[PDB]
């Protein structure tokens, strides 16, 4: 509540332009090469060209010398995977608030997010969040990250990642820090010509936010009633997704045969994608693609929301089939099939999409019969040496990471894969 009262700058897209949602009406000038996402116009893409800039000029009325002695900043960022060795040891600024090399800045490097304070004598202080690109599945590479930095010139600068304290360093051993009236959003000194960032909801606060305020800010801007894909964008209808099971990520979905005599199952291992000394990850663009189809969502847009009731279509050899099961089979594990859409009949197929209950959970798909009864969340079961996909009320009772925990993965420009 008093988090909006501490705002001195709050950038959002509104009615065909970026505007300040604080009461101080900062001037905001865009370059010719700034882009906005058509599904979420608050997502701002800046590329590595001189004309891809956002310059903010704060009104002189709100600029005073000690305005950055006690203040915080928050924003979301999505950083595409580094793939070129020119990016190693190439620190580059993305948010600059400095005059004569004094002030504060946010910068990036290979697997790093960096906050830097710098007085007029060139005494720097940095706090850093580090993530590796040598990792099977990363929570950070090309996925939306919530960043918060808090500053108290008596004590410490602190960087938080997804509401969690990462690094903290004292900033009391610092001289005079200039207070610029300008914040420059721009990739400054990046040698990767194809580098870009995506940001949203940049905020400036006139106080050092607590852990509690940071957590609550992370949760509100997380939109917990909307389902997310793997990258943290809104999950969507009529969109193709590769499936990743969070209990067994070194697997991908395959279909034995279409029809009621067949089944879907987790097959492994995944291939690796690599560039020597830059990254080594599991391939994400593998296996049978899922498509979510509207059944009873009345909302006109294509966004999947908590409790939406849907059909799941399954792509096999460029043809769509219907995920379904005969719930009358014996046992609580109901093996799933991929049926010709005309042949579904009265078999169970209606799926309740879940993001939370208000406890958020990664188990996304609760299959129902045609009388409103739970058949179970969609996961898998080890039958001998084959892990077949099932719906099972066992999951519903347990509801940690379970076999029903899934991520939906679309092809994204920030994660490029090329086989052979
Ligand atoms: C361990 C097991 O068999 N779990 C069954 C569950 O077992 C019931 C009791 O809880 C068991 O103690 C008891 O044991 C008997 C055996 O059934 C019997 O054949 C044997 O001869 O004697 C034992 C008695 O000493 O059995 C009863 C049932 O008879 O029964 C339920 C039925 O509701 C489940 O089938 C269950 O297996 C679990 O099934 C769900 C789907 O319904 C799911 O597949 C669970 O699997 C995962 C998961 O998706 O989370 C995935 C992994 O394959 C699985 N195992 C391993 C080794 O990694 C893990 C873990 O089991 C754990 O749940 C972590 O998530 O979970 C699957 O376990």
Numbering used by the authors: 877 to 1233, 1236 to 1277, 1282 to 1302
Can you quote the paper on this entry?
Botulinum neurotoxins (BoNT) cause the potentially fatal neuroparalytic disease botulism that arises due to proteolysis of a SNARE protein. Each BoNT is comprised of three domains: a cell binding domain (HC), a translocation domain (HN), and a catalytic (Zn2+ endopeptidase) domain (LC). The HC is responsible for neuronal specificity by targeting both a protein and ganglioside receptor at the neuromuscular junction. Here we present the crystal structures of two BoNT cell binding domains, HC/A4 and HC/A5, in a complex with the oligosaccharide of ganglioside, GD1a and GM1b, respectively.
Consequently, all subsequent analyses below involved molecule A. An initial inspection of the map revealed large positive electron density at the expected GBS, which indicated that GD1a had bound. Monosaccharides Sia5-Gal2 could be modelled with no ambiguity into the electron density and Glc1 partially, but there was insufficient electron density to model Sia6. A total of nine hydrogen bonding interactions were present between HC/A4 and GD1a —there was clear electron density for the two terminal nitrogen atoms of Arg 1282 which interact with Sia5 and Gln 1276. For HC/A4, eight residues form a total of nine hydrogen bonding interactions with the three principal oligosaccharides, GalNAC3, Gal4, and Sia5. Although there is minimal overall conformational change between HC/A4:GD1a with HC/A4 alone (RMSD of 0.88 Å for all Cα atoms); there is a noticeable change in the relative position of the HCN and HCC subdomains when compared to the unbound structure (RMSD of 0.6 and 0.5 Å, respectively, for all Cα atoms after individual subdomain superimposition). Therefore, upon ganglioside binding, the two subdomains appear to rotate apart like an opening hinge. Inspection of the HC/A4:GD1a GBS residues revealed changes in the relative position of the side chains compared to HC/A4 alone; most notably Arg 1282 (which adopts two conformations in the unbound structure) and Tyr 1123. Upon GD1a binding, these residues shift to form a hydrogen bonding interaction with Sia5. HC/A4 follows this trend as the structure displays a reduction in hydrogen bonding interactions with GD1a and has a reported 1000-fold lower activity in mice.
